[PDB]
Design a protein around this ligand. Sequence first.
Ligand code: FAD
Ligand code: FAD
Ligand code: NAP
Ligand code: NAP
Ligand code: MG
Ligand code: MG
Lengths: 443, 443
Amino acid sequence: NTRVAIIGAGPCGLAQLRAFQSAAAKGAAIPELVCFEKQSDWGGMWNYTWRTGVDEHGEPVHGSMYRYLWSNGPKECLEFADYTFDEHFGRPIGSYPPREVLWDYIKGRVEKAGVRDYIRFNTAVRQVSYDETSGLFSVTVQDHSNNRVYTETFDYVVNACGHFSTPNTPYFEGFERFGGRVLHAHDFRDALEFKDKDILVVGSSYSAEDIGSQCYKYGARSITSCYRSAPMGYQWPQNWEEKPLLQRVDSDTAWFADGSHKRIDAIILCTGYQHHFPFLPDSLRLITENRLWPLKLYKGIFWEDNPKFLYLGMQDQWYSFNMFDAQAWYARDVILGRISLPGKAEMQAENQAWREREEKLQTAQEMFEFQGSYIQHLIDATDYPSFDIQAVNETFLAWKHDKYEDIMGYRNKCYRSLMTGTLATPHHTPWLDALDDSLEAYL
Amino acid sequence: NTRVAIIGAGPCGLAQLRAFQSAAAKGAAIPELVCFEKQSDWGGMWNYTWRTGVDEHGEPVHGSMYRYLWSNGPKECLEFADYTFDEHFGRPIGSYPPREVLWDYIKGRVEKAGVRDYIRFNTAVRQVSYDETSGLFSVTVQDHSNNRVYTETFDYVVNACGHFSTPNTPYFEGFERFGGRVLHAHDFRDALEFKDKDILVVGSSYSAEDIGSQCYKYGARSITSCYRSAPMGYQWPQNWEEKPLLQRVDSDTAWFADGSHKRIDAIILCTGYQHHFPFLPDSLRLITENRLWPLKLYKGIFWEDNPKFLYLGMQDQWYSFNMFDAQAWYARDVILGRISLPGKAEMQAENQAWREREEKLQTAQEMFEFQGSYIQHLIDATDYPSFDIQAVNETFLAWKHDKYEDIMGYRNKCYRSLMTGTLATPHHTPWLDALDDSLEAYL
Ligand SMILES: Cc1cc2nc3c(=O)[nH]c(=O)nc-3n(C[C@H](O)[C@H](O)[C@H](O)COP(=O)(O)OP(=O)(O)OC[C@H]3O[C@@H](n4cnc5c(N)ncnc54)[C@H](O)[C@@H]3O)c2cc1C
Ligand SMILES: Cc1cc2nc3c(=O)[nH]c(=O)nc-3n(C[C@H](O)[C@H](O)[C@H](O)COP(=O)(O)OP(=O)(O)OC[C@H]3O[C@@H](n4cnc5c(N)ncnc54)[C@H](O)[C@@H]3O)c2cc1C
Ligand SMILES: NC(=O)c1ccc[n+]([C@@H]2O[C@H](COP(=O)([O-])OP(=O)(O)OC[C@H]3O[C@@H](n4cnc5c(N)ncnc54)[C@H](OP(=O)(O)O)[C@@H]3O)[C@@H](O)[C@H]2O)c1
Ligand SMILES: NC(=O)c1ccc[n+]([C@@H]2O[C@H](COP(=O)([O-])OP(=O)(O)OC[C@H]3O[C@@H](n4cnc5c(N)ncnc54)[C@H](OP(=O)(O)O)[C@@H]3O)[C@@H](O)[C@H]2O)c1
Ligand SMILES: [Mg+2]
Ligand SMILES: [Mg+2]
């Protein structure tokens, strides 16, 4: 028969396994599936590790999540249409669960699907090549359980390796003279490390917002944030100041674009991440900034130069889990032969049409509605349940307004599931005081 | 003609270029040489970076050196026989220079040799394969200057990528519950980060000795060290306690094998490094612990399954720079056809003979004399100057006794060059008080 390689057992890889299992449960013949995962367990970014830099086997540490991390959007926006919160938890819960609670939810679905046996854990993909004549990809991997490098062939490769793990780490004048810790958001683990310290966060997106907020919540003496161009602009607490871009640092002091200065103990670069695919030749290698519409990906998925090489989840994310499902189901239907792809020139013209719309977006609302409309297109093409994109959009709108209202209070609010209609119930403790991050303490 | 790939422009790679240039200066025809270096400049481990984890291009950070690092052995033990300290510095200096001063020395030789133009910087080796019929290696690299992956063929590959950059990072019960920083020695940058903090160093070799010592010198409140089996055993200062192995950690406290405990702010794993060659297939991939005599390396250099694949500097190090020269000169003479290699079975028998001697070593003296005798064998086979191994051995003996005498004072002592006979002169400031690490301040 035919063979599919899946790189990664995070949400996207797991969605891809779930897609095939769902078809198989309803009598479809499916390919052989091999999912290569470098970590010891599934969950991707949702799997926490204390490790930083490089893991015990010498691979770059994948994990960017930190202690005390909670859902940064309404859980109702990322609900699986085919495995509801009601089915998983059997009661209502808060709209903004800690990492461990959503990890439990993600695992719950693939536990139920019985797909764990497709996965080869502790295995890092090292190289991918393609042979024109056989139409096969050769995938070379290192099995760290046995310290052995091996290669197998596959008809399709689905790259679900993520793009929020390889840091974008810009130098600033004087980092080599500064006496405090300099790290990337990717290396941030326990905010208690910065208790009673004066912290600088460099950046103006979610990592800056949230890492700064954890430092606040867990007793940092002061937060300073700085932006390259656009301030985050929220009303910050008393001990937080937002400044224009860092110019330089000396042994202990940071100097900003406006000529102001601050004594700081540590610098956290919240400067985003790179799409980094060291295991790909240029012929297969997506090169893009973090955005809603990278080019060369037909339906945001199929590599236009070789559409038997697929990318999942490589867009920037408003939607997340149910976008990955939408992608995984479309990918599956194409691999099964149910949906055929057009010719390259047509794929290129359509990708460019999406790009032109992408380039016009200005407002947050335009941006999540763009991605909503992309997902609507995918879900209409397959048997993934066509859920209510418009109502999810309205939830995202409400969340944005909650964050404006109170950047430290938005996680206390409650939203209705668009899959089941059940309202989320208030959490037992306000976010700011909910110091314990465990699944036990939350439930 | 013929082509040689060299992986890395650290001391070993540079030694390899210097070896060929030295032969060429005296009329030898030499191969085309391409040295691939992932960093932006030469020097290897001696090139300092503030970066930790992964570099700006997404490659694991190579650098393990930290602020305030000085020579941990007498400089007279690592002198180049073909480029003396006298020639480079034109006067005597201390026996234990800061990193920047020996970097200057290393660069000085290859500046004089004019070999920089062989090197392709910002280029990471990604894969190596070998073709039986052509007898060529295919070396695939990523050029980060241009974001392009390319492959070229070579008759020989000399792997000079080091083995003190990929950390050995063991888990200890509770690391995911501890509130302070957990890092490896590889990530240690500025000891001022730990000023007034209670530090734990895990390990009992050079990284534990020296990182603990920097923390001491730069005002850590206390140092705790712990050993897996053998204590370091030096007489430590008042605020330093050596303990048996860490058993576990809670939110702020470490618990040891003897039942004792200590509140700690940060944990630094000084637990060594891995030989990690992700760019090699198993057919070419050396698997070894850090030791004086890994197997499968004929004359400690030639991969016994394919001796056109060479490893430099993969032994544990008492000797360093002039061992790498000795290796590089032997490698060069074999590549030039001046020295022929015996058959595999003979290579295996001889490697095993070295191993049997290696396995019997117990004392520090036995260990550096073993490596001395290995180097004597290499230097006698080529035109590298046959320098006085016995006197270098006696210097190593004297250094060991100086460290016993005073683990914070040994860097104040002076030793005679075995290349020129000139005595090192006392430094202007005692190590403990010499807070400034610059080349300027030292000279
Ligand atoms: C710090 C952080 C917080 C977040 N918080 C939220 C949130 O609250 N809500 C939300 O909806 N989204 C959040 N996200 C978004 C996140 O991207 C998605 O939730 C989701 O994890 C993406 O799934 P993925 O499978 O595409 O990638 P990932 O979850 O990153 O998984 C990629 C997988 O590929 C594996 N892998 C990588 N390279 C290789 C290789 N060479 N060989 C083998 N395996 C490999 C990894 O180990 C990993 O398991 C967050 C992201 C980050 C970085
Ligand atoms: C923290 C520390 C302190 C030390 N202090 C001393 C001392 O005081 N005295 C002493 O004699 N020795 C010291 N050493 C020993 C050190 O190993 C040697 O001095 C010497 O640096 C080894 O040279 P090398 O060229 O084998 O390896 P390295 O100096 O490590 O150089 C390896 C090179 O290969 C490059 N590289 C790696 N992988 C790739 C790739 N895939 N593609 C392209 N390039 C790559 C690296 O960027 C680097 O330039 C120290 C070592 C460490 C780790
Ligand atoms: N659940 C949570 O609480 C949580 C926490 C952290 C992260 N996350 C998730 O992690 C993902 C990534 O978010 P992110 O914020 O890390 O990345 P991001 O959204 O890609 O944003 C990158 C930030 O870096 C800035 N930047 C880039 N280069 C810079 C430079 N040289 N100097 C200064 N600033 C620079 C950008 O500024 P410009 O925009 O001006 O270029 C932007 O503010 C998202 O999915 C996010 O939701 C979630
Ligand atoms: N110039 C300088 O001042 C300086 C500073 C730092 C490093 N260096 C150099 O860096 C190189 C590496 O030295 P290194 O000390 O990092 O490595 P190393 O010499 O390989 O020693 C590794 C240490 O880790 C211990 N260890 C290993 N696994 C462990 C575990 N699971 N738990 C507890 N302990 C464990 C070992 O104990 P056992 O031996 O009991 O196994 C040993 O003490 C050397 O060339 C060194 O000179 C130089
Ligand atoms: Mg951006
Ligand atoms: Mg060891």
